[PDB]
Amino acid sequence: ANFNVPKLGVFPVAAVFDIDNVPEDSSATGSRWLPSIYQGGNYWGGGPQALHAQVSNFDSSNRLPYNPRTENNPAGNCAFAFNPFGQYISNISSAQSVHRRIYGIDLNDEPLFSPNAASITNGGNPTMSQDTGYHNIGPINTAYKAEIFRPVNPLPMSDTAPDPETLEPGQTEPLIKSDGVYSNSGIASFIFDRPVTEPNPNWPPLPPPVIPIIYPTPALGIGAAAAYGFGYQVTVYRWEEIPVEFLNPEGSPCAYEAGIILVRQTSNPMNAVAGRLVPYVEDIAVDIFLTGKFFTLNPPLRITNNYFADDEVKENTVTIGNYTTTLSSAYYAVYKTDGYGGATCFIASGGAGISALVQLQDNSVLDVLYYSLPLSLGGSKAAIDEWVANNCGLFPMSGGLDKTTLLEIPRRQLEAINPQDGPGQYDLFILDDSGAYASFSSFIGYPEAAYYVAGAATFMDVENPDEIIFILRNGAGWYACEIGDALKIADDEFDSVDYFAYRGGVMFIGSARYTEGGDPLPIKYRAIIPGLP
Amino acid sequence: ANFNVPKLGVFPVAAVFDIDNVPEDSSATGSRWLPSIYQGGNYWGGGPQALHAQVSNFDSSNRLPYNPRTENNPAGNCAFAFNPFGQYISNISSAQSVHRRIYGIDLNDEPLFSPNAASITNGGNPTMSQDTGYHNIGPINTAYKAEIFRPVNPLPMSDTAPDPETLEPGQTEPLIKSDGVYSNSGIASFIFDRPVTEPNPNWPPLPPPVIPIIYPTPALGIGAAAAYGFGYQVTVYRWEEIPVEFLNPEGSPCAYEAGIILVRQTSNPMNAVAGRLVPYVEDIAVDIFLTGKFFTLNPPLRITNNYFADDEVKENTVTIGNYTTTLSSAYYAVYKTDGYGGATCFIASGGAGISALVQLQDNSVLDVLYYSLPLSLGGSKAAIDEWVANNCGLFPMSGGLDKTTLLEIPRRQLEAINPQDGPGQYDLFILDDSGAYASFSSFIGYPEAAYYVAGAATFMDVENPDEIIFILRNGAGWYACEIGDALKIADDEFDSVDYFAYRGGVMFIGSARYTEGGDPLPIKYRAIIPGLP
Ligand SMILES: [Ca+2]
Ligand SMILES: [Ca+2]
User: Fold this and answer.
1) Gene Ontology cellular component (chains A, B)?
2) What are the b/e assignments for A146-184, b being 16+ CB within 10 Å?
3) SS in 3 state form for A67-116?
4) Residue numbers in A near B110 (CB within 8 A)
5) Which alpha helices (DSSP H) does A393-496 contain, by range?
6) How far apart are CA B261 and CA B495, in angstroms?
């Protein structure tokens, strides 16, 4: 719905200052601290402060361990979702390993875990990687480690023929039944901010409710999981029968039977026993608790954060990760600034994938929380802006003022109080009596106090100097500030407003300069104070 | 030996310039691009250029893999020595493992390597670390990995009783003799820039001379080694005897003997064979080729490199490693500068240990080669200066001019052509007619062309303004440049020379300023051109 905004007047210039005590910026390069009138789409601005993000070259060594920030792990730095899972697949090979390991035949034996490929790919949001350097089963490298092998029921042992000199049946490990029934373990999903737990048998009323089994190490991207019921079958043998017989006169020994086993004490042949080793098929089941190490690639970032304060220009720079050489500028980047070195930024090196929500103060990184831009956004600036607004509460409020037949701006940017789209958020505020300005003028606005001060209302005729726009955030009305005097150079020539910012009731202007030949010169900086109510 | 240097005259000031177009530096802080007259000990200066090195906080995750730079591995970044070694110790446990692995009983079996602790400590120059995350033998983590197990002689197999239905003796693995002779392997020293090789049997005249066995991965700090002759003993059994016998009339079978084994074909009891399984003790020897992963802690570094050029002041900053927050300034640091952003630096975060030789150009790290300061230097500035000169060809030539009864300087700094100590390198050059200057004046000199221009000859009397010293590098003579006019402020007051640099026949001066109360003000910068011959 449209809403008319009447021009209530013109704010006269109360003071002008040449800003000379500052570093030289080439008009062909741009201001190092003053955002250009074409950068409204990169800011939710609050003052003469400018940021730029560079992406360092990287490789598979620039890793971000999966360390999710949650209620239970507030010190983690990941905000994106990742839910890996898999199973221990049972077959002659893996059963062999589990078997030899639980019976103590060989403690280096361990079955190989089978991750679900798609849960690792994670819909490419972001694409995760398994750290195969984490653990190895012999010559095989794996990102998984069996921590605990727990048989569900006490392990069976096979009986053996009674001892000749003791008649006491011995013992030996059951033999795996190669053609028996194999059972894959259940679903093992890794968790990172809390241990794997099982319900306390006698929970009510004895605490604790659950019992911790194993712990993940989120700082290292190590997750924990439980693979219940890995099963295979074995052949167990049990002793049997009795004894007795009657062998006499010139001897004392008898004979008969088939398939049976007769043993007679070596110290006393009269003391005897018999029986058989009956083979039974048994189910071996074991719960296996494991850990998994994951990560995603994270290109190092370098951010400059410069602003004007105390009449000077403070330059800052920060790096995140092992920065080496620059690969390019960040694909996407929006900055909310306070005008004094404070800034919340959302930086995405690419059009999708790993992104960083950064909190800055001068050259200090107060915090970094990582997000991931879904591939579905198709690298669309407009699409990402909405996604960031929804997931981080950030939106480029400084971009929005536009001049078609008249100046107009959406409620959202004008009010600059709610980053998310919503009812009435796209209502259009049209400024009346603003038709003379040209269509090609660009605006970067600063929502402060009662006004949305947008810089850069230009004219098709050189004779008319640029004007700054002050719009009441309640839509009640707007004012213009003619800064012709402040911008006047030659008798008939004027400096244009190419860089603009507004803070504490003060306007900061940057003007591009060139030689008669067209060679870049230092940007002219000025400070203009409007006579506000 | 002393050498007299006569004062040949006074170089008049040909021009003076107020350097105003530069950033504000607090007199309580120091110049950001102009070295102070007290920093001669940190430079082999070449112009108005200043550097500072900060050490980031770090932990065991900030690693420097051992990647030595040598003729065969020119892309490595380590220059310090490290020679780890160890052996595979033979005993029932390790023999068991090697045995089960070479005979294919269990392929996850691997003996544990025994490093020589002191070779790892490396005399703390620097202290090296083993990467136990590199490989594991079951639940045990280790920095070593057996790559190849090579038996010296073909593995023996034990015979077994002939097959009842075939009469053909079978086979089975020999049994380890628990109380047999165990032999530790030979010395295994890891190498990083070339493979482990063995001489080519038929070398002359058939190439190649040596044969590559395994390769190290220096970029990952992975070294390679050969552990020859790991030995243990086994009990091997061999078949024996013959057959024949004569059992008749109502039968066809005989009996006798003791400890012997008689087998009669199941399909033909008449076809028979006999013998015994004779046990012999055999020596099993195996060469084992392995890799080892090492590294040393490397605190990230951040370096500012600022200088004046094209009448402006260029500020640069570089980081090496994953810099986070600052822990402190580098303990030791010397910089050789060209005056235009180019610099070779030797930075040591601590008083001993890992150090970096860095090549810079503005904000670009051209190269980094790591060295190690021996603990024996006792963190002594003077001791390290000599060590760096000897191992890197770097010495703080800008520090050396001193005024006792007269100005004097050692040949080494004066000539500024050879960083190493040596004959005549400490000959003292004493400037005649320089006795009026005060003892507490400080000097930072710049060896350029024919002169060693040292800034800061001060007087005990405020009435006399500071003077700049020009000494002929051949010791032929010296000149002074009275810059009283250029430094004059009040009628009876003068600015002092607190920061100084000299380049292209131009003198750069920095002067500390304060309020009548004693509050710091911006440093006053000037450019003075002396009327040279
Ligand atoms: Ca337009
Ligand atoms: Ca002195």
Assistant:
1) virion component
2) bbebeeeeebbebbebbeeeebebeeebbebbeebebbb
3) CECECCECCCCECCCCCCEEECCCCHHHHHHHHHHHCCCCCCCCCCCEEC
4) 108
5) 411-415, 484-487
6) 112
User: Measured between alpha carbons, how far is residue B84 from residues A466, B115, B123, B226, B292 in Å?
Assistant: 72, 8, 11, 12, 9
On the CB side of B303, how many CA atoms lie within 13 Å of its CA? 34
Q: Work out how many CB contacts closer than 8 A connect A with B.
A: 43
Structure tokens, B36 = 């102070």
Going along chain B from its start, the domains and CATH numbers come out as 1-41+397-532 (2.105.10.10), 42-65+298-396 (2.60.330.10), 66-297 (2.70.250.10)
d(CA B55, CA B76): 23
How is residue B435 written in tokens? 């006795």
- Overall resolution, Å: 2.2
- Distances in Å between the Cα of A138 and the Cα atoms of A144, A527, B133, B249, B518 are 13, 71, 15, 63, 72
d(CA A478, CA A473): 9
- Measured CA distances, B515 to A95, B28, B178, B450, B518 (Å): 85, 12, 88, 40, 5
| Residue B308 CB burial class (10 angstroms; 0-12, 13-18, ≥19) | buried
Which of these, A375, A393, A392, A418, lies nearest to A121 by C-alpha position? A375
Q: Which residue of B has its CA nearest to A220?
A: B61
Ligand 2 centroid–CA B348 distance in Å is: 28
* Count of all residues that appear for chain B in the document: 533
- Cα→Cα distances A485→A7, A15, B521, Å: 21, 11, 35
Strand, helix or coil at B132? Answer: coil
From A133, which residue of chain B is nearest by alpha-carbon distance? B134
Closest CA to B395 of B370, B426, B350: B426
> Which chain B residues in 46-105 lie under 8 Å from chain A, judged by CB atoms?
100
The breaks in chain A (C to N more than 2.5 Å) occur after 246
| Residue labelled with tokens 């630096």 | B345
Task: Report the alpha-carbon distance of residue B280 to residue B282 in Å, rounded.
Answer: 6
- With tokens 């919503």, the residue in question is A422
3-class SS at A414? helix
